[PDB]
């Protein structure tokens, strides 16, 4: 609701190798915390949090978004 | 890397429910984190019963 209330923030981005075929979901963090951030979520329920300005991770989102 | 800034207080309707991830590194809370059908992230309470049913549910409707 605009607040820190409830609110997840990357702190800092997942380095390496998006794993493409385990991934199951994904969410963009609230625009009030410091990193803009993509995080994915894997089938087996790993978090990783992701830079959206990066190739692949928009390539990742836009398989997510053709399911 | 994730960090849980404080756990939501109150009800969070079932029928907004999409999935669920739990990270327990710190900073994270070791929260439930719940990913709504808007496409938000609502870090909870481990430990609040309220929360344990949402995953419950949200478990039980996977495996079915």
New interface residues.
């Given amino acids: 609701r605009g607040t820190?209330?409830?609110?997840?923030?990357?702190?800092?981005?997942?380095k390496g190798a998006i794993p493409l075929r385990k991934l199951?979901?994904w969410?963009?963090?609230?625009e009030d915390c410091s990193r803009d951030a993509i995080?994915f979520?894997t089938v087996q329920?790993?978090?990783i949090?992701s830079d959206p300005n990066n190739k692949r991770v928009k390539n990742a989102v836009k398989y997510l978004q053709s399911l």
């Fill in positions: 820190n209330v409830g609110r997840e923030c990357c702190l800092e981005y997942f199951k979901t969410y963009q963090t609230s995080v979520v329920g790993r978090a949090c």
